[PDB]
Each structure stands twice: as C-alpha cells, then as structure tokens.
Enzyme design. Sequence first.
Site, PDB file in Angstrom:
ATOM      1  N   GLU A  78       0.390  36.761  21.815  1.00  0.00           N
ATOM      2  CA  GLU A  78       1.296  37.220  20.875  1.00  0.00           C
ATOM      3  C   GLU A  78       2.543  38.501  21.320  1.00  0.00           C
ATOM      4  OE1 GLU A  78       1.001  38.305  16.831  1.00  0.00           O
ATOM      5  OE2 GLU A  78      -1.049  37.377  16.630  1.00  0.00           O
ATOM      6  N   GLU A  97      -5.437  22.134  10.223  1.00  0.00           N
ATOM      7  CA  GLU A  97      -5.256  22.372  11.371  1.00  0.00           C
ATOM      8  C   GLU A  97      -6.176  22.828  12.502  1.00  0.00           C
ATOM      9  OE1 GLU A  97      -3.525  23.685   8.809  1.00  0.00           O
ATOM     10  OE2 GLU A  97      -1.658  22.893   8.575  1.00  0.00           O
ATOM     11  N   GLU A 147     -10.369  29.339   6.999  1.00  0.00           N
ATOM     12  CA  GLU A 147      -9.645  29.256   7.751  1.00  0.00           C
ATOM     13  C   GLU A 147     -10.244  28.073   8.945  1.00  0.00           C
ATOM     14  OE1 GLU A 147      -9.468  32.231  11.045  1.00  0.00           O
ATOM     15  OE2 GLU A 147      -7.416  31.583  11.770  1.00  0.00           O
ATOM     16  N   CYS A 156      -3.310  36.796  12.536  1.00  0.00           N
ATOM     17  CA  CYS A 156      -4.869  37.246  12.886  1.00  0.00           C
ATOM     18  C   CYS A 156      -5.493  37.234  11.433  1.00  0.00           C
ATOM     19  CB  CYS A 156      -4.914  38.348  13.618  1.00  0.00           C
ATOM     20  SG  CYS A 156      -4.198  39.860  12.830  1.00  0.00           S
ATOM     21  N   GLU A 210       5.070  36.204  23.153  1.00  0.00           N
ATOM     22  CA  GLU A 210       5.877  35.775  21.773  1.00  0.00           C
ATOM     23  C   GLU A 210       6.632  36.783  21.329  1.00  0.00           C
ATOM     24  OE1 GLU A 210       3.987  35.057  18.262  1.00  0.00           O
ATOM     25  OE2 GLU A 210       4.767  33.074  18.012  1.00  0.00           O
ATOM     26  N   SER A 241       3.423  34.605  13.404  1.00  0.00           N
ATOM     27  CA  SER A 241       3.182  34.483  14.665  1.00  0.00           C
ATOM     28  C   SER A 241       2.494  33.043  14.814  1.00  0.00           C
ATOM     29  CB  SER A 241       2.102  35.303  15.102  1.00  0.00           C
ATOM     30  OG  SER A 241       1.773  35.029  16.487  1.00  0.00           O
ATOM     31  N   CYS A 295     -10.722  44.787   8.934  1.00  0.00           N
ATOM     32  CA  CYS A 295     -11.927  43.855   8.771  1.00  0.00           C
ATOM     33  C   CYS A 295     -13.222  44.869   8.749  1.00  0.00           C
ATOM     34  CB  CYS A 295     -12.052  43.088  10.294  1.00  0.00           C
ATOM     35  SG  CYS A 295     -10.725  41.999  10.211  1.00  0.00           S
ATOM     36  N   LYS A 310     -12.184  33.724   6.668  1.00  0.00           N
ATOM     37  CA  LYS A 310     -12.336  33.061   7.947  1.00  0.00           C
ATOM     38  C   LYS A 310     -13.092  31.568   7.659  1.00  0.00           C
ATOM     39  CE  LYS A 310     -10.894  36.067  10.871  1.00  0.00           C
ATOM     40  NZ  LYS A 310      -9.764  35.695  11.999  1.00  0.00           N
TER      41      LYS A 310
HETATM   42  S1  SF4 Z   1     -11.776  40.647   6.701  1.00  0.00           S
HETATM   43 FE1  SF4 Z   1     -10.089  41.092   5.411  1.00  0.00          FE
HETATM   44  S2  SF4 Z   1      -8.423  41.978   6.780  1.00  0.00           S
HETATM   45 FE2  SF4 Z   1     -10.209  41.127   8.189  1.00  0.00          FE
HETATM   46  S3  SF4 Z   1      -9.610  39.031   8.610  1.00  0.00           S
HETATM   47 FE3  SF4 Z   1     -10.746  38.830   6.796  1.00  0.00          FE
HETATM   48  S4  SF4 Z   1      -9.346  38.938   4.915  1.00  0.00           S
HETATM   49 FE4  SF4 Z   1      -8.292  39.685   6.837  1.00  0.00          FE
END
Ligand code: SF4
Lengths: 92, 642, 560, 156
Positions: free
Chosen positions: B274, B361, B356, B294, B277, B314, B486, B353
């Site tokens: 990053e 992808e 994700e 992220c 970039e 990004s 997080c 996550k």
């Molecule tokens: S814990 Fe909250 S701030 Fe961290 S990646 Fe997950 S959603 Fe985003």
Amino acid sequence: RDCTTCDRNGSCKLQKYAEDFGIRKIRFEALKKEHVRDESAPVVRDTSKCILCGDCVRVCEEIQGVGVIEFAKRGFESVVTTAFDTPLIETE
Amino acid sequence: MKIYVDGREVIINDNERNLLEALKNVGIEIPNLCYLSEASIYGACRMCLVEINGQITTSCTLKPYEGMKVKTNTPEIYEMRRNILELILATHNRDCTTCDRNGSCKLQKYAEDFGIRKIRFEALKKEHVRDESAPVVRDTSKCILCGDCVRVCEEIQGVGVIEFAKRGFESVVTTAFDTPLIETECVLCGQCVAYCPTGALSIRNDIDKLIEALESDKIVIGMIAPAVRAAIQEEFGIDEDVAMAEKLVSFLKTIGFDKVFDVSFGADLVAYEEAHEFYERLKKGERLPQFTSCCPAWVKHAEHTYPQYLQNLSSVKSPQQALGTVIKKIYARKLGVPEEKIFLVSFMPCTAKKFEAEREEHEGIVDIVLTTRELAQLIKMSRIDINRVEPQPFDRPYGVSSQAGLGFGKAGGVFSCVLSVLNEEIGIEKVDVKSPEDGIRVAEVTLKDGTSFKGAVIYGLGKVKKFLEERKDVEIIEVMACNYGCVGGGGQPYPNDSRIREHRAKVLRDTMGIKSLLTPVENLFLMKLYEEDLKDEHTRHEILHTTYRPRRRYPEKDVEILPVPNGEKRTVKVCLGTSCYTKGSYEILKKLVDYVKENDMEGKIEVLGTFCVENCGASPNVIVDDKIIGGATFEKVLEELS
Amino acid sequence: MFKNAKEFVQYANKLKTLREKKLNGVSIYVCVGTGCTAKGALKVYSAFEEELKKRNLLKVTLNRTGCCGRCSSGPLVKIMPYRFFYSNVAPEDVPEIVDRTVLKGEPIERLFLTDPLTGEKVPRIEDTTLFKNQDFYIMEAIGESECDSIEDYIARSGYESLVKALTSMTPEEIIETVKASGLRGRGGGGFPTGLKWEFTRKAQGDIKFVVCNGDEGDPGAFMNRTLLERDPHLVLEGMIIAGYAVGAQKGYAYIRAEYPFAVKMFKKAIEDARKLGLLGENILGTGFSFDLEVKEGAGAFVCGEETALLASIEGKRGMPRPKPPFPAQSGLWGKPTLINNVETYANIPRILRDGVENYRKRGTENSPGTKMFSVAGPLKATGIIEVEFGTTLRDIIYNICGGFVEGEEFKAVQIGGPSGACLSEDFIDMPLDYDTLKKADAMVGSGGIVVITKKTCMVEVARFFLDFTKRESCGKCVPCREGTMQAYNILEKFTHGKATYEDLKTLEHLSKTIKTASLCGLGKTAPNPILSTLKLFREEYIAHIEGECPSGMCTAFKKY
Amino acid sequence: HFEKVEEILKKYGYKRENLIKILLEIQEIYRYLPEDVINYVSTAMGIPPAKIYGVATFYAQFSLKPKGKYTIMVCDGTACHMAGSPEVLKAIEEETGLTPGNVTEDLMFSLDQVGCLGACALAPVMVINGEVYGNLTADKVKEILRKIKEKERESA
Ligand code: SF4
Ligand SMILES: Cc1cc2nc3c(=O)[nH]c(=O)nc-3n(C[C@H](O)[C@H](O)[C@H](O)COP(=O)(O)O)c2cc1C
Ligand code: SF4
Ligand code: SF4
Ligand code: SF4
Ligand code: SF4
Ligand code: SF4
Ligand code: FES
Ligand code: FES
Ligand code: FES
Ligand code: FES
Ligand SMILES: [Zn+2]
C-alpha cells in the site's frame, strides 16, 4: 432446554458446558420422551431435565434409607421415578 | 442534595438527571431492563418503579429534588416488577442452552433472581423472523425490543439497515420487508451484535467445520489477528497478558494445528504494498484521495454508497486475504503439497471477515474464519488452564512481524505502518496530527524532498459521510468501521463497551512495545518473500491485488399470484396500478387466473402481478416474456402466449 | 379588507346583507355531513341540482350544510322562507318536493320529523322536543349554514372575534380572558386551556407552533369530524387566535386521512382564509403573521397522545416518550407547541365574542360551557347532540335521544370509549362534569357515548375494548405491549367458556400493573373496561366461569 | 425509471416531514406500497429503506399488498360491534374465505376492519368501494356478496 424457569439456572454444570462448548444448534432431532412432571408435594419432580446421573437414587437409598425413587424402564425410556409413577405425596 | 430512601438518610449528588442514575452512583441498585449497553435509553422496561407521595412512578424519569421520600421496595412494586418480568418471559424464546448470551444475559439473571419457575401467562405465538443468511444471525424470538441495535446501526454506524416495524404485539426489529440481512446494505460490522443484550443478534458459529477439518487428513494452518490476542484474555476472567499469542499457538498446536502463523506478517506485507501504491498515486497525482481496503465492512459500505470512489480504494487486499493467498499459492508449492490439501483457518476479531473470506474474488483461499469468542470456546472446551500454558513462537516463515504490523489491530494502525514504510524509503521531515473530532485524526506529513500530503484516520463508520462531504484536502484516508479499530470488532468478547475497548488498545500497545524490529523492511522474512517469490510485478499483482464492484439492489419483488418455483415458463405479469386498474386490469387478471385454473396443468404459465410499468394512458398493461403489449385483454395475452 | 379592519367590517356587513337577501328568498340546504351521505345525501343534492336545472328556475339557491344533529333521521333537507324540515329524503321523491313545496309551499306531512317522546310530527326542528331539550352554543344555525363557504361564515358574524383580538386586544389579555372563562380541555383530560396557553407563551423561544388534534380518541365517536365538517372556519379562527395569543407563526391541523370530507373541507377553509387575507405574511396589516397546514393522519389511535402526535407530524412513527419535558416547552422540532382538541379551538372564538360571565351562565362553577357528544347504540334518535356541563345520563338517553327502541332495555353506557368508563343505572342520575363524576370512577371523556342494552354481554364489551387496545398499542413499553395482549387472551378465554377463577385473579392483578406501570395514557387506561365491568358486572364474569352467560350470546355453549 | 413518484417527491421537496403524505399519494397511485417504489423513494430522499418500512407498517392506511378489486371496509366501532359486526365478518369469511387484512387469490376482494364511519344509525355498517350497506346481517351480507360476484363474473 428452558433455563429461565429452572432452579439450577446459574448453578448448572450442563448449562455451563452448553455455553462453553459453543452448542448453538442441535442437528439431533428432539425425540419425544414420556416425561413425568409432578407437583403434588413440596418436592417437585420433572424428568424432562433429568440427566439420569443416579445421584438422587443413591441419596434416597444409601444416605436416607427410604429408597422411594429408583431407575425404571430401560434404554431411551430410562427414567428415575417412583413405583408406578405414583405421586410423591402418596408414597413413603 | 440529601434524600430519604426507605427511611434512611442518603446523599446522592449535587446535580443529577434522574433518581435511578443518582442512586446507582451512590450504590443503590433498582432492578431494570433499560440500561443494557452504551446505546441504551430509559423508559421502555418500566421495572424501575418507586413510590413517592403515595403514587408509583418510574425512577429513570423522575428528577431528584432535595428532601424527597422515596420507597424503592413495597409489596405493590414487587407484584408489578414480577408481573412485568413474567410478561417478558412469557413470549421470550427460552432456550438458553443454545443461546449465544448464555451465562451473560441480564434477562436470564433476573429470571434466576426473581424465582420465576412457571409462566402464569400464555406463551403466545408471534410472526418471528429467523435470518441465518449472513455471519450476523437474527432471531427475533429472543428480542426484548430494547432498541439498542437500531440506535447502534443508525447513530453509531450510519447505515440504518435495521429498524422497528409494525406495532403492538407484532412489534419487531427487522430489515425492510424481512429481507435477508445478506441482501441488504448491511456492512456486517457486527456492532449490533456487540451491543445486543440478548441472543437475538449473534455470530454464526463455525466450530463444527473446524473440528471436522482437524479430524480429516488435510494440513490445517491457522493465523491469528493482532487484535485477537489483545482481547481473548477477557473470556477467562484474567488481566492483560503479553505473549498471549504464543500460548495460543501452543494450544492450537496441541489440538492438532500443523502450522500457526501471524496475520501481523500479512499486515506488514500489505502495508509495504500500500505504501508503494500510494507513493505512485501521489507522484502521478491521480486516483486521490486513496482509501484503505483493510476493513471489509468499509469496503462493502463504499460499494453500496460510493460507487464513484471504488477506483480510489486501495487495490491491495486485506492482511487476512493477502497472507492466505500467499500461503495457498506459495507455501503449498514450497511444501510440495496440492492446494486442496491445506485447510486455512483464520482467527479474527471481526464478523465482516467471515463475509470477506466468502467473497467471489477470494473464493477458496480462507476456508473458515473464527471470531475471538469462537477461539475462546475452543479453549474452554479443552479445560486447559491457558494461563499455565507455556508459550512458543509462531511458525516460520510467516510468524515474525514488526511493531507497525501488530499496530493494525487498533485505529490508526495501517496509516502509521504506511508512514513508517514511507519514512524508511524516503524520510519524513515532520508529522503534524490534528484531532477535529473524537474519532477523526488528520496528519500533515512532509517528505524529505518536499512533496507533502494530508492523511486522515477515521474509526467508527458513520463519521465518514460528513468528512467526505466537507473535507477534500486529503490524499489518503484510513477508515475503520468499528470504534477504536479492530479491538472493538463485532467478534470480540462481550461486553464490548468503550472502556473495555480502550483497555484492549492499551494491551495491544504494550504487546507492540516488546517488538524489536520496528518497520516492515526490517522483517527479513518479508524481504525474503519478495526476493524469491514476488520478484516480478505480474505475480505480485495476481497475489496481493483485488478488484471491487458496485453494489445495487436488484429487487423484482412483484406480486405472486400463481408462482412457479422454477422451469421454463411464460411469466405473465399483470399491471395492478390505479391507472391500469381503472379499466379491466383486475378483471383480466381474473380471466387469466381462471384460465390457468382450467388449463395450464403444469408450471408452463405463471400468472403474476406487477406494479405500474410506466405505460399509463395506454390501456391496461400485461407483461409477457418481459415484453410490453399495451391494450391488453385476455384474448391478446392468450395469442401472445401462443 | 387586505389592508385593515375597516374594509373587513364593510365586507362583513355587505355579506350579512347578501345572506339576509338570499335567506328571505327560496333556498335549499341538504345535510352532506357523514351519516346522511351514508344514506344518500349526495344523491339528494344531485337530484335537486338536476330537477331545478331541467325546469330551469334557479331564484332558488342550492347549498350544502353540515350535521344537524339528527343523523339517524335519514337525509336532512330544509326550505328557508318557511323553515320546514324534511327527513328520510329519498332521491326518488325530490321532484315531488320541488313541485309541491319549493314552488307553492304546501307542507308535506309524510316527510316530516317524528317525536319520540310525544309520538307526533312537528313541521320544524326548532320546535322539536329533542331540539328544545338540548343546549346549542357551538352548533349555530343548524341546517342553514354553508360548510363550504367562508362568505357564509363571515355573513354569520364569523371571524369578528379574531379581528377584535388582533386590532384591539394583546396576547396577554387574550390569555387572561381565556383563563378567567374557565374553559377546560375538551380532549378528555379537562386541563384548563388558559394554563396551557400561559405555559406555551411563557416558554423561552422566538418560534412556536399551534397544533390541532382532530382525532376523536375513540373508535365509536364522530363528534370531532362532524364539528370540522360543520364549521371549519370556527376551528380555523380559534387556531389563529391561539397562535396570536401564544405568539406562534405556524399552525398544524391533524385530520385523519380516513375522513376525506373533513380533510377537503378544512383545506378549502384554509385556502379561502388565505385568499381573503385572514392568513398570510401580514394579517389585516397588524404586523402579525400566521399560516396553517393540514397534516393527513395515516391512522393510529396512539397518535392522540401529545408526544405521539408530535412524532407523527414530523414524519416518524407515532411513538410517545416520557412526557416531561412537556410539549408546551419543547414540542415540534423542540420548539414550544400548543396542542388542543378541535372543540377547544371551537370554544375559543365563542368565549372571545361573548364575555366571561355570559359564557359561565352555562354549565357549572368548575366546567362552564357546553359539550358536544355523539350518541350511538339502539335508540330512537341517535346522532350528534350538545348539552351543558350539568346534564345527567338519563336526560341524554331518554329526553334528548328519545329512549330505546320498543323491545330493548338499558344495561350500561360507555362514555369515553376504551379509555372511558362503563356506567350502569346506578350512576345515570349524575350530572356530567369534569369533577362530579371524575371521582366516582368515571369520566366524561372525549365526548363519545354508546348505550349497552340487556342483550349485550359485558365480558364481550371488555374483550372488544382490550382487542382494540392490543391492536392499537405502539409496542414501546413492556406493560402495554405484553399485558394488553395477555389480558385479551384471558378475556377471550372467558368468552369461549373455558376460563377459571385463577384466570380471574390473574386478570385482576395484571390490570393494576398495566394501569400503573404503562408509559403513556393508552396503556394506563387500557384496563379501564376490565376494572369497570369487574366493579359493576362481577356476577357476569362469575357466570362465564360457570359457562352461563346470562345475556346468552357468546357462541360457546348452546344446544348440547 | 420513475416519473410520477419523482413528481410527488419534487412537490414535497424530499422533506421527511412530508414522508407520510408522500406515501399516501404513492399508495393512491399504485394502490399499495411496492418494495421497488419505496426503495426508489429511499434513494431519492436519502433515507434508509428500513425507516420507510417502519413508518409504512405502523399506520393503518398503508397496505403492502394490493387492494382487492372490491375493497370491503367493515366498521368495528363500538356501536357497530354491538350491533353484530362479528357476524358480518364471519359471513364475509365463510363466503369469500378471508379475514381482515387479507386479499383473495385473484385480488377480487380485500377486507379491512376500521373504526366508526360516522353512520352508527346504520350499525352494523359495511363499505365497498364507497358504497355503504347498513343494517347488515349474515343473510344480507351473503346476498350482497353473491350479487356482486355475479355482476363481476358477467364481465360482458
Ligand atoms: S473489526 Fe471492525 S474495524 Fe476491524 S476489520 Fe472488522 S469491521 Fe473493520
Ligand atoms: C391513546 C390516546 C388518544 C388520545 N386521543 C385524543 C383525541 O383524539 N383528541 C384529544 O383532544 N385528545 C386526545 N388524547 C389526549 C391528548 O393526548 C392530550 O390530552 C392533549 O393535551 C389534548 O389537549 P386538550 O386537553 O386541550 O384537548 C389522547 C390521549 C391518548 C393517550
Ligand atoms: S438422576 Fe436424580 S439427581 Fe440425577 S439429574 Fe436425574 S433427578 Fe437429578
Ligand atoms: S437471551 Fe438467551 S440466555 Fe438470555 S434468557 Fe433468552 S434464551 Fe436465555
Ligand atoms: S452488522 Fe453493522 S451494518 Fe449490519 S445491521 Fe449490525 S450494526 Fe447495522
Ligand atoms: S435485537 Fe437485541 S439489541 Fe436489538 S432490540 Fe432486540 S434485544 Fe435489543
Ligand atoms: S402504554 Fe402502550 S401506547 Fe403507551 S408507550 Fe407504552 S406501549 Fe406505547
Ligand atoms: S429503567 Fe427502564 S423504564 Fe425506567
Ligand atoms: S398503472 Fe399500469 S402502467 Fe402505470
Ligand atoms: S350528518 Fe346529517 S344530521 Fe348529522
Ligand atoms: S360505530 Fe360503526 S359507524 Fe359508528
Ligand atoms: Zn357472554
């Protein structure tokens, strides 16, 4: 599994393991059991919460010498109950 | 201000908003089901009843005045409080064994304390909703309608995807039209779950998949997130502990993990990519301002809300996906084992996550994502004293990381890591940081040559809208969907309030303090990974870069009269608007329904209803094979159907 | 009149002359108020229109009037030069009316009003015994006032009070006279309106609001919409006077969308007032600005609560909130707001025109003025009536409404809807007042009245009211949301002949919790029917526990 | 591509204070509140769809399912209820097989139980497309429902 209306709520080992083991679903079907509920005496019986550990039977027989509750039937139908499902207030 | 409580002298406070808070400050507790989280309000539970001047009233809405005689416990108040609690429990889905709040539920504790053992009221049935389509699971049968989740999603997260609907006994907190949460604009931040006081909102538990994978013959590989080690210690009632990650490694290896890595290595790699970039973007002065990618919740929010800024996001993928792709595509080859043989387990503090890892992808890279609570459940099942576990270091070559990489776990981590990388590549003359608001920080950065930029760090979604609308003097923006980063993620241990989040940030800072290498470049394993594996730009792009696509709802949701679940058919839709209804539309619909009643034995015909098709003043309109007819009538729809 | 009061007075005098001129001649008024239109009043108006046009002898004038208080007596029509009153005017016999009466003027005996008390037909409603037994103070010119005409309202001395308040008086003296008059809130609470106006005026803030609560607060009452359709300009004038008194520059009328006629009529009245200059940037060149807007009510009983009404106006869900801070300080969008009923605003200009002693001549020493009601149930004459605050239930039931239909007896009476009280014969001889019966477990209520007969089951009445409340609860607080449904379930158990004594005790103890712990007034008064019937008709509940139903209707046990 | 809805939104200037009136207008145009239509309204006014759904499902005048060709409006007021409204509702159910708030298969009939219509002298009272039938009983309700069914079935 109805802990809100249970006397062991908050002091139940099975409840604590269900919490710790992360059990959030039951892939095993909730099979129907011939459960016995009794409210005739100050001592209340509810075999739907029984884990068939046998502690009560030993307490009643060996420690108290009465032996009015004992294991009946066998297999999936195993139940701790009084002779002929007699209400507790009507037994010895 | 001195008051009388049950007949004894009590000194509460000079100025107070209500009697309940004043007494709580003193240390006198009044039972209530309104104060349940930071996003709580007063007035709904009605359980704080007190007696004053004869009449009973709620103490949360009563202003304390000097010399006031209040009786907090009378037989009438006991009767009323027990009645209210029984009312709550009568319609509550009382299955605590399979509930996610088991052992940490205020309603359960009250049921225990109030000696409620029978339900004097009928367990009346409601039209409950059970949404399990997303990592955030909804079950309204356990909802107490406190409204904390609505306030969290609207006032704190700025999304507003869940709201109160209907009224009375049918009152329910839900999405629009009971739409599955996966199909809404939900970013899956999990803050509603973090604030929910019951099991109505919970995280999807995937421990069974992990266990069946460990039992199999595949090579199970785990990676831990930086913020997971800063909060796991809460679940066991113990204080902060550096080296938590290493004893976690010990436990995971004990339960059968072949390799355990650190996502901080992936964070350092992502920061390096990053930084380069962003430097290219600056030197070309294009695609600015840049946005960090992220946070998957922020990425999904941008896809739903800022399709124009999707080119400014990004290209680098998140540390989880970057490290997982590195593993599956490079470590497997280095080990001489097919990619099908590796099972990748991600231990994260985030519920987004999970989404994700299932993105189109990122298919097949990360097998399962487990939250911090799920890892704590794994530890608790074994019953080992994790405190007594001897720590051991992460497995190589993805086990070591720099302080900047571990800083990713809290707000301002990726920006600081990028700044460190830039400073090492090209020095930074000075950084000047401002604090416009509570969760917004702007830094003024000048490079050695003289090219300067302004980078902003924003934690807590919902603060992004105003900043993006009013501020255009930045070149790089870090967005974290959860307050404090997080450390306050959706998958973190409960309760998840701000004080606990600040303590978690302090723990993570202490853990960072004991890191020798300070910048990603000092990470020799990372430079090795570039030297032998990511040498050329083609593989680097195919490994560490991803693409983003806009999200728009595609709802047809037209009236279903005689639907056909599937199969080749004709899908005839009849307009039901007022203009078309004015002459023949409904009567034509009746003709078609009766026609398929006598004819159309199979699902060849699907008599369907649709709203105005923007063809008014052109006679009743009936759709055929997604074609416009106009002047529709039974004979015309028949012949077109022929 | 768009500059000062002199031209307004000239306009009013000329309109009075025109109205007298038209009245002296032949003119027709058909009551197009709700109820009569349900019977075909619009068809009668169309019949008059077509018949008078085909013969082409219109110097006759055809006009639409408001409720005349005899809704049950068919469509209502009256001819002015000889003030004959016609009832049950079928659209088919309109040509007969035109031929026999409008041209010649011969009385039509077959189409007159009967007399329930004396059993005879009187040509004029003014001479009817029911009309004499009433006390009309708000309802003026029954059957001869044009609802859809600001011109007629001005010709009837309307809007004079607002001009007097603006040009002559100052808000302080307006509030003082309102306080002295003793007018009490007609919404049901009975709180002195003058105190509310003082609270709103003294509130700190430049911008303030005036809100009208058009809801009847009862699913069995139509008094408010009837008043709105009768004289929209009376309520409009009251609202403008209130805005001037409390220093507000904006007014909001809240009329249910379920009433198209009331909404349209109030919109027409507002547009006419704006056109005449009574509303706008500068009213009568006195430096006072005011405008009004109608807010359609999408339909929610809870929106009668002040906080819920404010939430609904702003476009949100009608969710009430802890009342303090009161809306008189922080209401609409946080600004001070004055909220009153329709009949309160209707009374305002009447009080202003007359004095305080003259106003207080009617009623009692605590509750001066009149109360418009809406009587329903099985009775000879049902509809809209107005009585002073000293009458008894017997007077209304028998003397004014003519009593019950032959073969039907009195059992109980509902006086305030679900939030009201259930009174048996023991309290029939009690003078209506905000204090005399507010202590004997009763209340005058918003103004709805329904009579319960011996063939009506009181357990069923309680079940119906609890079902209404369960449907209407906003679902915010536990007591109302849950307990109302639980109480409805228990009452349903009683109705289906499968209840027990334990259920009776559970209902009794849950009613107290609902009444005390509920947030707003909807839940607080939710168990009022249960408590009333238990206190007055306990033996019926006991009989249902024994599967009897002495009234014998609950289709739960029969022919075994 | 929505035009009439855009006209309404421009008329009320995308102000949330006019959201209820906008929804009323949209309902009178479409006969109900389609999901797509209020998604478009949400996008135009910058208001989350969940908020509009909460508002729409709170008030009675708003219906999420299409209105029937013959919309039946039965009064549930106190006088009408004690005059035999439950019998009217039972007759409607046993004749058309529906309960208040529901619609028929072919959208021919829809039922709603509402408050006093201002015609208590006609209790029990029923309204069908602005046609009020008073002094109703099970026999009369069945008779009128059958008559309207025949009339509509004729089609012609
Ligand atoms: S814990 Fe909250 S701030 Fe961290 S990646 Fe997950 S959603 Fe985003
Ligand atoms: C459920 C409910 C419905 C109500 N409906 C009405 C109503 O229809 N009309 C009214 O004037 N007041 C109604 N009220 C009372 C008002 O909310 C409140 O008393 C208001 O201040 C009326 O002002 P007023 O006293 O000047 O009429 C209702 C209250 C509740 C709890
Ligand atoms: S066997 Fe006896 S002691 Fe053991 S759980 Fe059952 S009842 Fe309780
Ligand atoms: S929320 Fe869960 S733990 Fe709490 S009472 Fe309900 S089922 Fe039990
Ligand atoms: S996960 Fe976040 S965006 Fe989704 S409903 Fe919960 S708070 Fe709203
Ligand atoms: S889902 Fe949870 S946070 Fe939301 S209202 Fe229900 S109990 Fe409260
Ligand atoms: S009492 Fe009923 S209507 Fe009033 S706030 Fe509580 S739930 Fe809502
Ligand atoms: S604390 Fe819940 S109503 Fe007072
Ligand atoms: S109503 Fe059918 S095209 Fe618009
Ligand atoms: S509406 Fe005509 S007399 Fe009442
Ligand atoms: S109660 Fe039904 S019309 Fe009045
Ligand atoms: Zn009965």
